[PDB]
Amino acid sequence: DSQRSTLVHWFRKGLRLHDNPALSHIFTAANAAPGRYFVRPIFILDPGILDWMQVGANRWRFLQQTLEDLDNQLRKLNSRLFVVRGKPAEVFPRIFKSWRVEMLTFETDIEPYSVTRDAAVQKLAKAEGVRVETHCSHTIYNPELVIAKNLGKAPITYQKFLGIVEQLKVPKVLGVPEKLKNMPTPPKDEVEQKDSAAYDCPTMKQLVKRPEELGPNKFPGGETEALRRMEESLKDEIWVARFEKPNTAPNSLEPSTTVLSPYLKFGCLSARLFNQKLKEIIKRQPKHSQPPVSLIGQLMWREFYYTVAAAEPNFDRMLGNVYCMQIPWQEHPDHLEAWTHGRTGYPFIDAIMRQLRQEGWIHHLARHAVACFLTRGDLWISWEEGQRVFEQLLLDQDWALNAGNWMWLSASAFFHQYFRVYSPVAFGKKTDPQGHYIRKYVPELSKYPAGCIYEPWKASLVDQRAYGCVLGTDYPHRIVKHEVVHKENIKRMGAAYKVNRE
Numbered sequence: 001d002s003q004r005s006t007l008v009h010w011f012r013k014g015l016r017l018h019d020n021p022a023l024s025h026i027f028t029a030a031n032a033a034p035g036r037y038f039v040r041p042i043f044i045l046d047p048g049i050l051d052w053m054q055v056g057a058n059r060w061r062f063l064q065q066t067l068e069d070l071d072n073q074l075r076k077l078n079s080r081l082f083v084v085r086g087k088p089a090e091v092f093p094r095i096f097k098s099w100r101v102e103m104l105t106f107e108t109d110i111e112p113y114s115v116t117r118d119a120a121v122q123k124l125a126k127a128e129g130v131r132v133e134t135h136c137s138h139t140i141y142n143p144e145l146v147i148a149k150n151l152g153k154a155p156i157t158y159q160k161f162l163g164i165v166e167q168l169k170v171p172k173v174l175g176v177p178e179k180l181k182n183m184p185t186p187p188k189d190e191v192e193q194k195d196s197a198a199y200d201c202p203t204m205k206q207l208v209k210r211p212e213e214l215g216p217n218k219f220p221g222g223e224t225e226a227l228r229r230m231e232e233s234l235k236d237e238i239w240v241a242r243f244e245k246p247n248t249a250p251n252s253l254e255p256s257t258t259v260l261s262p263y264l265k266f267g268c269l270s271a272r273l274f275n276q277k278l279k280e281i282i283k284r285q286p287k288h289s290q291p292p293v294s295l296i297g298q299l300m301w302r303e304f305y306y307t308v309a310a311a312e313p314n315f316d317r318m319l320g321n322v323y324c325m326q327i328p329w330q331e332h333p334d335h336l337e338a339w340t341h342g343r344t345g346y347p348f349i350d351a352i353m354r355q356l357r358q359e360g361w362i363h364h365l366a367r368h369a370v371a372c373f374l375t376r377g378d379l380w381i382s383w384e385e386g387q388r389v390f391e392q393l394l395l396d397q398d399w400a401l402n403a404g405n406w407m408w409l410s411a412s413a414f415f416h417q418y419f420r421v422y423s424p425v426a427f428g429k430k431t432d433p434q435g436h437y438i439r440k441y442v443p444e445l446s447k448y449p450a451g452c453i454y455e456p457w458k459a460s461l462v463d464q465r466a467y468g469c470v471l472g473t474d475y476p477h478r479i480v481k482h483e484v485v486h487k488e489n490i491k492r493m494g495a496a497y498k499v500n501r502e
């Protein structure tokens, strides 16, 4: 009857209860002063973007599942999730007054949109007397401290980055907040009085406006599934200890790596928790792998890309990007849409592009293959176009990680040995000589013998008819001949590399 002010936590990333310092500070404070505070954990959902085509339906569904899981977990603590519809610029001045907000917390984000939006709300909060407290728990280290320790610039090599963060101190990992005590549900504000369900978690139908893009629900969203999935990947301590990234297959029928990337992108899983549990396993396993190929090395790859991205607001762009080589990519809408829909005539990369569309995840080396094909390998199209397609279809779509890896693959930054080119025919044969992966995702070739399913043009016309799929009618011809265009493109990279040094 005497709760006079509301404490608010604001989810954007960090969609978990565990290891969430911003959220547990609100819960601790509320329990330390029983009867003074109402608590409101909020997510702000702008309905204007549900139609944006850069967010595929698979990612929308992941988000719906994550928010439901989050609301369920918060109910066990005598709270709940409040999903507020609106744009933050209009929501915060209302609830600041209406809920009499005393404190606001959230996890920090380095993406340029977030940085400016957060600065706006900080300004408004200072004016309105609201104390703001932010925490850096999306990453293991704080990119500003690593850039500081490096005398003001981001390290541009992996090994150098490791040298700095070795000097850094590792944050302590928190558990879950404790059940709220002596706290009734908050009284209804002006909009809850008009509709008691106005802040309820949205249904699938409300979030997924194009249900026809949905594929099979292989990777459910949310913290509960995140933690369950981590535990099973660590149950086999020897597999964890001897993990070597380049030796995992891109084209096995079940994933050869952890597929924790979607959960780390949304914050359903704490990277700091994952890192600590991995440290404990390395400790008691005397022969283990080392960075960069080890599992801890993979998390360090995430950390590296986040800190260089923090220093450059054009990280997702060629021009204005201080890291990125200026390379004269060409435009070809026909080649681009063929790549985009997995109709290039190279069965291996077509199968990758179709797994991506249907399922929303593909293995790291599968990404290397289709990215190299689109850019410096064959089509000579800008990595920005590949970033665009990946952004639509990837569950783990991440601003820094997508752009950084595309600049790497296209030899625009961080990696410069452009003479190495992946072969669209040969690369996958090493790990799937029978072509099971191709048969699953390119089912029109599923009756081809293994001796030509990677290169169906080697089959005669009589054989093609026997296999049930003739090139040019049931499956396209190669849109380019790899063995000639890749030689040309190696020359153009040398030309562009001269112009940049000069």
Ligand SMILES: Cc1cc2nc3c(=O)[nH]c(=O)nc-3n(C[C@H](O)[C@H](O)[C@H](O)COP(=O)(O)OP(=O)(O)OC[C@H]3O[C@@H](n4cnc5c(N)ncnc54)[C@H](O)[C@@H]3O)c2cc1C
Pocket: 245, 257, 258, 259, 260, 261, 262, 264, 265, 298, 299, 301, 302, 303, 305, 362, 363, 364, 365, 367, 368, 371, 390, 394, 396, 397, 398, 399, 401, 402, 403, 405, 406, 409
């Ligand atoms: C063109 C291209 C685009 C990419 N875009 C993304 C993206 O949008 N989102 C994304 O999360 N990763 C991206 N990656 C990196 C990498 O391919 C994925 O992180 C990884 O395949 C996810 O599978 P996993 O969780 O099983 O990885 P694991 O091998 O199990 O590694 C564990 C975790 O380490 C991190 N990690 C692993 N490899 C990398 C890497 N190369 N760079 C950065 N972090 C890494 C991720 O958090 C990952 O979940 C991209 C790579 C390429 C070549």
